[PDB]
């Protein structure tokens, strides 16, 4: 058993409704107002083919920028300097106000919700995961602290060989509804997390999406809110965003915290703006000044042994669901597969959002090109 979870609506039984019960009372009152949470759905546009390039002033310093964005399969690109949008690009077929999947940039948003609860004193990172989710006893998450989950410093037997259906990475997707279920699969994301094991060692960075979903589970047990609602209450609703975000949900309504958020490029930039404003957003403080400082400061360098990161950023690290380059500019970024970045350039008080669809999730080739663009754009913002 995985214990108590937030009801889908007031008074709802555990796990209700399902795809097979949403038309029945009392579920249908909620379901008729939220059917997209149950059944895949398409937008029917209220509005009745060419790329939009407004690269502004940086165009002079980067003459080939649009071509470089095309080459890295850029869907949406936006540069926010201070409070001003100083450059934008959107591919043909993608509107400025269209939403885009964030993949693991979603993790940085989840970490922010955790940080909000730390600021309120409702989560103590020094406490073991099991203080908040006792049901994770007996798993790899029995022993580690919440901070070790935040910094991803837990050794976990988590096969990343996606093509193999036996792999933890594909099983995670199937448990959450991102892929077709196979017989015997865990019923939901919570159950999948409880199946995870490790040798018990901690302290070395291991990037693992399961960690973020454990964070979301902790958020739910602490607040009593669905992660979907907590993500709004503690972050999204304070941003003065143009549009709602969306997040995929599994069969229990649990948001896929590690990777399933979609939003507009301009709205994602508001998250970066909040980080560069010491944790404060238009709707109020989101996280503490200290939390932001710790993110910008980085994690333990010795923990970071991922050569896919350190080959480019030798002094890099990871903390609280953010990648920290440790470069001379102090750049920090949310990163998601296929070319998603929420990139912070504190030196110029700027945020760069790049949302993409590389044909491949993660190769040295694509990262070299993408990081070259982000760094060139960052430097183009320097006073001269």
Residue with tokens 């108590």: 4
Q: Which of 346, 322, 319 is nearest to 333 (CA)?
A: 322
- CA pair distance 221, 235, nearest whole angstrom: 18
Contact 244, 237 (CB under 8 A): no
- CA pair distance 310, 316, nearest whole angstrom: 6
Q: What is 255-293 written as a DSSP string?
A: B-TTT-EEE-HHHHHHHHHHHHTTTEETTEE-S-HHHHH
Report the catalytic residues: 104
CB-neighbour burial class of residue 293 (10 A; exposed 0-12, middle 13-18, buried 19+): exposed
Experiment type: X-ray
Contacts of 145 (CB under 8 A, 6+ apart): 125, 126, 127, 128, 129
State the CB neighbour count (10 A cutoff) for residue 274.
23
- Range 133-170 burial, b when 16+ CB lie within 10 A, else e: bebbeebbbbbbbbbbbbbbbbbbebeeeeeeeeebbb
In CATH, 49-121+226-384 is 3.40.710.10: yes
Contacts of 324 (CB under 8 A, 6+ apart): 295, 296, 297, 298, 299, 316, 317, 318, 331, 332
Strand 100-101 relative to strand 246-247: parallel, antiparallel, unpaired? unpaired
Q: Which of 150, 120, 100 is nearest to 233 (CA)?
A: 120
Q: What is the CATH number of domain 122-225?
A: 1.20.58.710
Contact 119, 291 (CB under 8 A): yes
- CA pair distance 100, 340, nearest whole angstrom: 10
Residues shown for the chain: 384
Kindly list the domain boundaries of the chain, sorted by start residue. Answer: 25-48, 49-121+226-384, 122-225
The CATH number, out of the four listed (3.40.50.1860, 1.10.10.10, 6.10.250.420, 3.40.50.300), of the domain defined by the range 25-48:
6.10.250.420
Question: What resolution (Å)?
Answer: 1.6
């Amino acid at each position: 058993s995985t214990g108590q979870h937030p009801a889908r609506y007031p008074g709802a039984a555990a796990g209700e409704p399902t795809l097979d019960s949403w038309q029945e009372p009392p579920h249908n009152r909620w379901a008729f107002a939220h059917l997209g949470e149950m059944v895949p759905s398409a937008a029917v546009s209220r509005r009745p083919g060419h790329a939009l390039a407004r690269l502004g002033a940086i165009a002079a310093q980067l003459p080939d920028l649009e071509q470089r964005l095309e080459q890295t399969y850029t869907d949406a690109f936006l540069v926010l300097r201070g409070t001003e949008v100083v450059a934008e690009y959107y591919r043909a077929g993608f509107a400025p106000d269209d939403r885009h999947l964030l993949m693991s940039v979603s993790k940085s948003l989840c970490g922010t919700v955790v940080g909000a609860l730390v600021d309120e004193g409702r989560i103590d990172p020094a406490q073991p995961v099991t203080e908040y989710v006792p049901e994770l006893a007996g798993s790899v998450y029995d022993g580690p602290s919440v901070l070790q989950v935040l910094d991803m410093q837990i050794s976990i037997d988590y096969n990343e060989d996606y093509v193999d259906p036996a792999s933890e990475v594909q099983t995670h997707d199937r448990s959450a509804g991102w892929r077709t279920r196979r017989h015997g699969d865990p019923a939901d994301t919570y159950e999948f997390l409880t199946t995870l094991r490790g040798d018990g060692s901690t302290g070395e960075f291991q990037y693992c999406s399961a960690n973020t979903d454990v964070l979301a589970w902790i958020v739910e047990r602490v607040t009593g809110l669905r992660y979907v609602e907590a993500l709004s209450t503690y972050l999204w609703a304070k941003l003065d965003a143009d549009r709602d975000a969306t997040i995929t949900v599994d069969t229990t309504g649990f948001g896929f915290a590690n990777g399933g958020v979609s939003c507009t490029a301009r709205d994602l930039a508001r998250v970066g703006r909040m980080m560069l404003d010491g944790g404060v957003a238009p709707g109020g403080r989101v996280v503490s000044e200290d939390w932001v400082r710790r993110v910008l400061a980085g994690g333990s360098h010795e923990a970071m042994t991922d050569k896919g990161f350190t080959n480019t950023f030798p002094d890099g690290s990871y903390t609280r669901q953010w990648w920290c380059t440790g470069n001379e500019r102090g750049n920090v970024s949310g990163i998601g597969i296929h070319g998603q970045n929420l990139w912070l350039d504190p030196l110029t008080d700027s945020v760069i959002v790049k949302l993409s669809s590389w044909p491949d999730p993660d190769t040295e080739h694509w990262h070299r090109l993408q990081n070259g663009i982000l760094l060139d754009v960052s430097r183009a913002l320097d006073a001269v």
